[PDB]
């Protein structure tokens, strides 16, 4: 409104610069352009040694468009600078950096921001002194405004603490310079999903809200795809202006020179969904961007319409990681109390002790029992509170997972503990007790620092106890608040006094009804605010159990008057259902004060208590039946030892207890109460309760029945198999399993020995359908009629009674319980309920960056993890079924239960390193000649490989009709850049390949968990492995789109990718388009497969199993169809 800036974000969007960096390295700039060899590669120095550099690049930024420029600054810092010995410049660099871009600006009418980036030290690992940190950014912004900047801007924030400190550092800069500009704050978000420290983007907007911010956004880390759910999430919430300055996408090595893929026209695409859609008020580039980005961006935004930004922002607290709203909805925010030195015994010895894993320990239990907060008083008689702080603090600061409220009586304290502690904070002690300026030094450090503000309802005249008294304080106090310290209501959190009503004592015995009466009132008069109580004081001096009940009943009838938050044992409070009746009505007879003439509720209350009041407390049959369907693992060879000692024989134990878990088990999986990865867990239970018995019996029996079970030959590793030995097993009965690529021979050498009911066949893969024929072909010749169980994803229900003829006893299975119902039939434990358009010409041919294929090793697992299909994954690899469920349900169902297995599998194959990443991909001079693609040589134009693509019956479509013919003319420049001897050839298409894998480990690693019996973990981390695999097929593929120039094309949302939301296609060697295996041959001759540890074997499938080859089209019309 006041400064020109903000007027400008309301009336349109403001297109930043791009990268100051990588255009400073197209200059290619020597030790004496930098002042000296010590000098060489910092930036920031340019401003005293090259000015001329540095003011060219702005004017580059400008002439295309940008209304802001950043000054080069970004590591002006005493610490970071202190690396090149030019610690002492920060001030200089700074002043210098924004007197270029103004003189560069001011010509233009384009505005400046003095960028300050996050340092090189993190403050809340301790690696720099909150002090040392303040002090740089303090004399960096005082050069800025000096300088003349027209905003400060805080860029790349790792840290969520020193967000807090830099903000507080450069608004003092502000006043000590006499000049006050906006600040604009932009956090980065790693691929990974939070800040570096561990921030996500809830935590980091509750931070921003809370501290005097203009505008709040996004920059680096990652390019726009993944920016999207966070940039969306500042959009819609924040109530101050949002921007956004994405990368330029993964880097890439060519010839030593780094090179980013994602073009101007895809980021202009991205930054018109941010502003049309979403309503971001700033758009920039950051890595790899350049001034055609920046020129493609704001002709994209130019003349949009600002969305006016959300009024309010619900009140809400943070720790170091995650958010949690002050307003809990139908219940309280509750504050954990034991980590106070008076209250709690356990962690005052532990702080004297210096028992860190103690205390810690503690806080995780406070937390696992429901705390939203937790209380923290380390104030003893003598000790120095301080030093307390100063040891315990930095531990707490990266271990809780909620926020700290700082209960104390000093200020010192306060402000030592919001220099440590991430996020934002509550703090206790704002009372009147020793005047207002003791009081107002505690406001205008929760105002100063953002934090919420407990106000205590204590006056200079002594504490508030009465009705009257409790509201009178706390009016004075909401004004004091308000108009002299500018706090808005949302942040206070008014504690009218708890006060002891029990002891036996009179006076004590109608304070906690006035505090209730009082809190009524003040929910009407002050609307907006909160209400914390001390809620254990009320039962002081009181039996445990009579506290327990006293102090759960007083918390509910202070929330109904009106309390929004507590200080409490969260273990210990009680649901008043689970009171029984008289304590409860008693205990409310106490609160309010309702003394008959023959009665005191005290005494009625005291005396109730006496002379009255997990699983393991169960029979010992249903202990057992009921570990294996709640997948107990713990506890099971304890209690199985104990029934051998009772005498119970190890069959009887399995078919009564275990088998009756299993039985319940499945019938839960029919009913969509429990889904497969708990059904697995159940089968683990099952497993481990039968390894036990195994040394344990003479018995040694058949089972329900036999199953000879196999996967086909020149098939693959079918989990679905395996997964109907689990549960087959664990069901009772007998499975021999053969293993993957058998053949009928020793199929039925397993028939003879082992004498079974039925034979399993199965298969991953559709070309072992035929293969299947082909088995029941021979069966019937030797004259074998053994019930043949089929299934596969292959095969169809169809299909077998179509192949019924060949076969008379034959079944389908499309589950493992299918399979498992089957063989209930036939073993007699059950009744036998079972006895196209033509291709117009491509308006360009792309150009390609190369010609030849390349490798490309290390890339991002968590940027990969972005192009997951997990729908793919949850539903159909993991198997959390959609049956009998709503699609907002089961969106609930799978971001509680699988989106944590996703986000650990992710952090562990990043760490011990199982998926390994590699590519192999590239492009080659093609054309079409008849029937057949042609791949002509880049260096020779010799015909390497022909490709004979089938054609649909009855004159259709083929993938040879999305390539230009052999001689046609050019559509444009293709001369200029086709390889010569290829063109001159006939070559006047480009086609892409790829081979991506993430290697034999995560294979082998599947293998084990299964050998192992972990069962559950071994679809997990299967599942997984698929999926990231073709996660990197999808993420490549966009790859390839964007270095051929096509990827402008792509939708913005990344389900519609997995729906060919892009330009083209990518077809691989088993499709129906494409379906002879035998191609891949020529696709390894290509492009040499054993360069990314790869191999093709005899029978033409890719080794290891998490690898697949595509061919990869530009053609505008190209789509995925059938022979
Ligand atoms: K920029």
Same mark, same amino acid.
């Given at each position: 409104?006041?400064?020109?800036?903000?007027?400008?974000?309301?009336?349109?969007?403001?297109?930043?610069?791009?990268?100051?960096?990588?255009?400073?390295?197209?200059?290619?700039?020597?030790?004496?352009?930098?002042?000296?060899?010590?000098?060489?590669?910092?930036?920031?120095? /340019?401003?005293?040694?090259?000015?001329? &550099?540095?003011?060219?690049?702005?004017?580059?930024?400008?002439?295309?468009?940008?209304?802001?420029?950043?000054?080069?600054?970004?590591?002006?810092?005493?610490?970071?600078?202190?690396?090149?010995?030019?610690?002492?410049?920060?001030?200089?660099?700074?002043?210098?950096?924004?007197?270029?871009?103004?003189?560069?600006?001011?010509?233009?009418?384009?505005?400046?921001?003095?960028?300050?980036?996050?340092?090189?030290?993190? &403050?809340?690992?301790?690696?720099?002194?909150?002090?040392?940190?303040?002090?740089? #950014?303090?004399?960096?912004?005082?050069?800025?405004?000096?300088?003349? &900047?027209?905003?400060?801007?805080?860029?790349?924030?790792?840290?969520?603490?020193?967000?807090?400190?830099?903000?507080?550092?450069?608004?003092?800069?502000?006043?000590?310079?006499?000049?006050?500009?906006?600040?604009?704050?932009?956090?980065?978000?790693?691929?990974?999903?939070?800040?570096?420290?561990?921030?996500?983007?809830?935590?980091?907007?509750?931070?921003?809200?809370?501290?005097?911010?203009?505008?709040?956004?996004?920059?680096?880390?990652?390019?726009?795809?993944?920016?999207?759910?966070?940039?969306?999430?500042?959009?819609?919430?924040?109530?101050?202006?949002?921007?956004?300055?994405?990368?330029?996408? /993964?880097?890439?090595?060519?010839?030593?020179?780094?090179?980013?893929?994602?073009?101007?026209?895809?980021?202009?695409?991205?930054?018109?969904?941010?502003?049309?859609?979403?309503?971001?008020?700033?758009?920039?580039?950051?890595?790899?961007?350049?001034?055609?980005?920046?020129?493609?961006?704001?002709?994209?935004?130019?003349?949009?319409?600002?969305?006016?930004?959300?009024? $309010?922002?619900?009140?809400?607290?943070? $720790?170091?990681?995650?958010?949690?709203?002050?307003?809990?909805?139908?219940?309280?925010?509750?504050?954990?109390?034991?980590?106070?030195?008076?209250?709690?015994?356990?962690?005052?010895?532990?702080?004297?002790?210096?028992?860190?894993?103690?205390?810690?320990?503690?806080?995780?239990?406070?937390?696992?029992?429901?705390?939203?907060?937790?209380?923290?008083?380390?104030?003893?008689?003598?000790?120095?509170?301080?030093?307390?702080?100063?040891?315990?603090?930095?531990?707490?600061?990266?271990?809780?997972?909620? !926020?700290?409220?700082?209960?104390?009586? $000093? !200020?010192?304290?306060?402000?030592?503990?919001?220099?440590?502690?991430?996020?934002?904070?509550?703090?206790?002690?704002?009372?009147?007790?020793?005047?207002?300026?003791?009081?107002?030094?505690?406001?205008?450090?929760?105002?100063?620092?953002?934090?919420?503000?407990?106000?205590?309802?204590?006056?200079?005249?002594?504490?508030?106890?009465?009705?009257?008294?409790?509201?009178?304080?706390?009016?004075?106090?909401?004004?004091?608040?308000?108009?002299?310290?500018?706090?808005?209501?949302?942040?206070?959190?008014?504690?009218?006094?708890?006060?002891?009503?029990?002891?036996?004592?009179?006076?004590?015995?109608?304070?906690?009804?006035?505090?209730?009466?009082?809190?009524?009132?003040?929910?009407?008069?002050?609307?907006?605010?909160?209400?914390?109580?001390?809620?254990?004081?009320?039962?002081?001096?009181?039996?445990?159990?009579?506290?327990?009940?006293?102090?759960?009943?007083?918390?509910?009838?202070?929330?109904?008057?009106?309390?929004?938050?507590?200080?409490?044992?969260?273990?210990?409070?009680?649901?008043?259902?689970?009171?029984? =009746?008289?304590?409860?009505?008693?205990?409310?007879?106490?609160?309010?004060?309702?003394?008959?003439?023959?009665?005191?509720?005290?005494?009625?209350?005291?005396?109730?208590?006496?002379?009255?009041?997990?699983?393991?407390?169960? !029979?010992?049959?249903?202990?057992?039946?009921?570990?294996?369907?709640?997948?107990?693992?713990?506890?099971?060879?304890?209690?199985?030892?104990?029934?051998?000692?009772?005498?119970?024989?190890?069959?009887?134990?399995?078919?009564?207890?275990?088998?009756?878990?299993?039985?319940?088990?499945?019938?839960?999986?029919?009913?969509?109460?429990?889904?497969?990865?708990?059904?697995?867990?159940?089968?683990?239970?099952?497993?481990?309760?039968?390894?036990?018995?195994?040394?344990?019996?003479?018995?040694?029996?058949?089972?329900? @029945?036999?199953?000879?079970?196999?996967?086909?030959? @020149?098939?693959?590793?079918?989990?679905?198999?395996?997964?109907?030995?689990?549960?087959?097993?664990?069901?009772?009965?007998?499975?021999?399993?053969?293993?993957?690529?058998?053949?009928?021979?020793?199929?039925?050498?397993?028939?003879?020995?082992?004498?079974?009911?039925? &034979?399993?066949?199965?298969?991953?893969?559709?070309?072992?359908?035929?293969?299947?024929?082909?088995?029941? =072909?021979?069966?019937?010749?030797?004259?074998?009629?053994?019930?043949?169980?089929?299934?596969?994803?292959?095969?169809?229900?169809?299909?077998?009674?179509?192949?019924?003829?060949?076969?008379?006893?034959?079944?389908?299975?499309?589950?493992?319980?299918?399979?498992?119902?089957?063989?209930?039939?036939?073993?007699?434990?059950?009744?036998?309920?079972?006895?196209?358009?033509?291709?117009?010409?491509?308006?360009?041919?792309?150009?390609?960056?190369?010609? @030849?294929?390349?490798?490309?090793?290390?890339?991002?697992?968590?940027?990969?993890?972005?192009?997951?299909?997990?729908?793919?994954?949850?539903?159909?690899?993991?198997?959390?079924?959609?049956?009998?469920?709503?699609?907002?349900?089961?969106?609930?169902?799978?971001?509680?239960?699988?989106?944590?297995?996703?986000?650990?599998?992710?952090?562990?194959?990043?760490?011990?390193?199982?998926?390994?990443?590699?590519?192999?991909?590239?492009?080659?001079?093609?054309?079409?000649? +008849?029937?057949?693609?042609?791949?002509?040589?880049?260096?020779?134009?010799?015909?390497?490989?022909?490709?004979?693509?089938?054609?649909?019956?009855?004159?259709?479509?083929?993938?040879?009709?999305?390539?230009?013919?052999?001689?046609?003319?050019?559509?444009?420049?293709?001369?200029?850049?086709?390889?010569?001897?290829?063109?001159?050839?006939?070559?006047?298409?480009?086609?892409?390949?790829?081979?991506?894998?993430?290697?034999?480990?995560?294979?082998?690693?599947?293998?084990?968990?299964?050998?192992?019996?972990?069962?559950?973990?071994?679809?997990?981390?299967?599942?997984?492995?698929?999926?990231?695999?073709?996660?990197?097929?999808?993420?490549?593929?966009?790859?390839?789109?964007?270095?051929?120039?096509?990827?402008?094309?792509?939708?913005?949302?990344?389900?519609?990718?997995?729906?060919?939301? #892009?330009?083209?296609?990518?077809? $691989?060697? +088993?499709?129906?388009?494409?379906?002879?295996?035998?191609?891949?041959?020529?696709?390894?001759?290509?492009?040499?497969?054993?360069?990314?540890?790869?191999?093709?074997?005899?029978?033409?499938?890719?080794?290891?199993?998490?690898?697949?080859?595509?061919?990869?089209?530009?053609?505008?019309?190209?789509?995925?169809?059938?022979?």
């Amino acid at each position: 409104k006041k400064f020109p800036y903000l007027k400008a974000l309301l009336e349109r969007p403001l297109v930043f610069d791009g990268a100051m960096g990588t255009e400073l390295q197209k200059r290619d700039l020597t030790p004496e352009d930098y002042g000296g060899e010590a000098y060489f590669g910092c930036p920031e120095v /340019l401003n005293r040694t090259r000015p001329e &550099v540095v003011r060219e690049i702005h004017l580059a930024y400008l002439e295309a468009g940008a209304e802001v420029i950043e000054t080069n600054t970004f590591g002006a810092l005493r610490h970071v600078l202190a690396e090149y010995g030019l610690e002492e410049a920060a001030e200089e660099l700074a002043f210098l950096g924004a007197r270029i871009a103004r003189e560069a600006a001011d010509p233009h009418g384009a505005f400046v921001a003095g960028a300050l980036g996050p340092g090189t030290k993190l &403050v809340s690992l301790g690696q720099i002194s909150w002090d040392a940190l303040y002090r740089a #950014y303090k004399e960096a912004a005082r050069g800025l405004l000096k300088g003349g &900047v027209d905003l400060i801007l805080l860029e790349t924030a790792q840290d969520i603490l020193q967000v807090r400190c830099a903000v507080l550092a450069v608004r003092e800069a502000m006043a000590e310079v006499g000049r006050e500009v906006p600040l604009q704050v932009q956090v980065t978000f790693e691929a990974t999903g939070t800040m570096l420290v561990g921030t996500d983007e809830q935590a980091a907007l509750a931070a921003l809200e809370s501290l005097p911010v203009d505008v709040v956004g996004m920059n680096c880390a990652t390019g726009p795809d993944l920016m999207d759910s966070k940039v969306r999430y500042f959009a819609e919430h924040s109530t101050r202006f949002v921007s956004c300055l994405p990368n330029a996408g /993964l880097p890439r090595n060519e010839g030593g020179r780094v090179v980013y893929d994602l073009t101007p026209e895809e980021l202009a695409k991205w930054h018109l969904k941010f502003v049309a859609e979403y309503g971001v008020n700033a758009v920039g580039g950051c890595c790899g961007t350049g001034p055609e980005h920046i020129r493609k961006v704001a002709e994209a935004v130019k003349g949009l319409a600002p969305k006016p930004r959300p009024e $309010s922002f619900p009140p809400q607290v943070a $720790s170091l990681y995650q958010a949690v709203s002050l307003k809990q909805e139908a219940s309280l925010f509750l504050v954990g109390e034991r980590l106070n030195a008076t209250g709690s015994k356990r962690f005052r010895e532990m702080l004297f002790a210096r028992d860190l894993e103690g205390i810690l320990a503690l806080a995780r239990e406070q937390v696992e029992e429901g705390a939203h907060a937790l209380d923290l008083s380390v104030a003893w008689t003598g000790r120095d509170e301080l030093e307390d702080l100063r040891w315990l603090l930095p531990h707490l600061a990266t271990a809780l997972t909620v !926020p700290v409220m700082v209960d104390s009586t $000093s !200020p010192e304290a306060m402000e030592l503990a919001l220099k440590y502690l991430p996020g934002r904070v509550l703090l206790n002690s704002a009372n009147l007790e020793d005047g207002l300026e003791r009081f107002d030094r505690v406001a205008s450090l929760a105002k100063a620092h953002g934090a919420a503000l407990v106000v205590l309802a204590i006056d200079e005249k002594g504490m508030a106890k009465t009705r009257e008294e409790k509201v009178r304080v706390a009016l004075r106090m909401y004004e004091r608040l308000t108009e002299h310290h500018g706090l808005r209501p949302e942040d206070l959190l008014f504690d009218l006094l708890t006060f002891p009503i029990t002891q036996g004592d009179e006076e004590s015995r109608p304070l906690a009804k006035e505090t209730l009466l009082a809190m009524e009132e003040l929910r009407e008069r002050l609307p907006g605010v909160g209400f914390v109580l001390g809620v254990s004081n009320v039962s002081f001096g009181l039996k445990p159990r009579a506290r327990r009940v006293l102090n759960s009943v007083f918390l509910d009838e202070a929330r109904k008057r009106g309390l929004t938050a507590a200080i409490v044992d969260a273990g210990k409070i009680l649901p008043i259902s689970q009171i029984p =009746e008289e304590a409860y009505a008693l205990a409310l007879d106490l609160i309010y004060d309702r003394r008959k003439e023959g009665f005191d509720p005290l005494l009625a209350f005291m005396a109730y208590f006496e002379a009255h009041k997990a699983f393991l407390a169960l !029979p010992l049959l249903e202990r057992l039946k009921r570990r294996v369907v709640e997948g107990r693992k713990q506890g099971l060879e304890a209690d199985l030892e104990e029934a051998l000692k009772a005498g119970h024989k190890p069959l009887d134990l399995i078919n009564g207890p275990l088998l009756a878990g299993m039985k319940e088990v499945g019938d839960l999986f029919g009913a969509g109460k429990m889904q497969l990865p708990f059904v697995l867990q159940a089968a683990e239970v099952m497993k481990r309760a039968v390894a036990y018995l195994e040394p344990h019996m003479e018995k040694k029996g058949e089972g329900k @029945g036999t199953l000879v079970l196999a996967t086909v030959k @020149g098939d693959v590793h079918d989990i679905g198999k395996n997964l109907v030995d689990i549960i087959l097993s664990n069901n009772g009965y007998r499975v021999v399993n053969l293993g993957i690529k058998v053949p009928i021979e020793e199929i039925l050498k397993a028939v003879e020995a082992h004498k079974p009911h039925a &034979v399993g066949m199965s298969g991953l893969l559709v070309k072992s359908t035929l293969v299947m024929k082909e088995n029941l =072909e021979y069966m019937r010749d030797r004259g074998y009629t053994l019930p043949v169980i089929l299934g596969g994803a292959a095969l169809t229900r169809s299909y077998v009674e179509e192949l019924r003829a060949i076969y008379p006893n034959v079944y389908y299975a499309e589950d493992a319980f299918e399979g498992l119902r089957l063989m209930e039939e036939l073993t007699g434990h059950a009744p036998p309920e079972l006895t196209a358009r033509p291709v117009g010409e491509a308006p360009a041919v792309p150009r390609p960056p190369f010609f @030849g294929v390349r490798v490309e090793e290390g890339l991002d697992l968590a940027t990969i993890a972005h192009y997951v299909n997990k729908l793919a994954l949850y539903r159909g690899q993991w198997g959390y079924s959609r049956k009998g469920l709503s699609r907002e349900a089961w969106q609930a169902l799978v971001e509680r239960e699988a989106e944590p297995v996703f986000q650990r599998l992710l952090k562990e194959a990043m760490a011990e390193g199982w998926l390994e990443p590699k590519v192999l991909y590239g492009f080659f001079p093609v054309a079409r000649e +008849g029937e057949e693609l042609l791949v002509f040589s880049p260096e020779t134009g010799e015909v390497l490989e022909r490709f004979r693509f089938p054609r649909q019956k009855g004159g259709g479509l083929s993938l040879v009709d999305y390539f230009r013919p052999r001689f046609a003319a050019p559509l444009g420049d293709e001369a200029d850049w086709m390889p010569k001897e290829a063109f001159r050839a006939g070559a006047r298409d480009v086609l892409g390949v790829q081979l991506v894998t993430m290697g034999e480990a995560p294979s082998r690693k599947a293998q084990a968990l299964f050998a192992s019996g972990a069962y559950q973990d071994y679809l997990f981390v299967h599942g997984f492995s698929v999926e990231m695999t073709e996660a990197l097929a999808e993420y490549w593929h966009k790859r390839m789109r964007q270095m051929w120039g096509i990827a402008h094309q792509d939708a913005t949302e990344i389900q519609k990718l997995f729906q060919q939301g #892009y330009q083209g296609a990518r077809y $691989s060697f +088993g499709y129906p388009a494409c379906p002879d295996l035998a191609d891949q041959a020529k696709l390894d001759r290509l492009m040499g497969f054993h360069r990314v540890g790869v191999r093709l074997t005899e029978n033409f499938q890719l080794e290891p199993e998490h690898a697949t080859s595509a061919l990869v089209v530009h053609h505008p019309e190209a789509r995925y169809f059938s022979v």
